[PDB]
Design a protein around this nucleic acid. Structure first.
Length: 103
DNA sequence: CTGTATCGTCTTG
DNA sequence: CAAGACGATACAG
């Protein structure tokens, strides 16, 4: 039920975006196998240049716990304070932290 | 079993 | 009618 992007697909996605910008319908059609939502999500949350791939710092965790006390579970709002992370990363991180904290 | 990328679905633009 | 948003879920390791 999960069709995860392979490194090959990611590179193609990159090229397609370099070529067609933000025309997701058109970028998707370059795949036999992928829709607009899938490419849009993959770019926006994983491949865009601004996305951070470095592990969460202690200070980021601290900011997350602070921001949750402040905003509740409004992940997109909270993600504004994390330069290279999106709501996806912020909410995943909280599931993991709260788990290790004893939910 | 856990951590996390994807997906169902609702909401907003 | 596309894109944003969030909970749930698949699934690798």
């Amino acid at each position: 039920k999960k069709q995860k992007f392979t490194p090959e697909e990611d590179e193609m996605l990159k090229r397609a975006v370099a070529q067609h910008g933000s025309d997701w319908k058109m970028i998707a059609a370059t795949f036999p196998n992928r829709n607009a939502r899938q490419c849009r999500d993959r770019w926006k949350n994983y491949l865009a240049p601004s996305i951070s791939h470095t592990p969460w710092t202690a200070e980021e965790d601290a900011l997350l716990v602070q921001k949750i006390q402040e905003y509740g579970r409004q992940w997109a709002i909270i993600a504004k304070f994390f330069p290279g992370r999106t709501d996806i990363h912020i909410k995943n991180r909280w599931v993991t932290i709260s788990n290790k904290l004893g939910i």
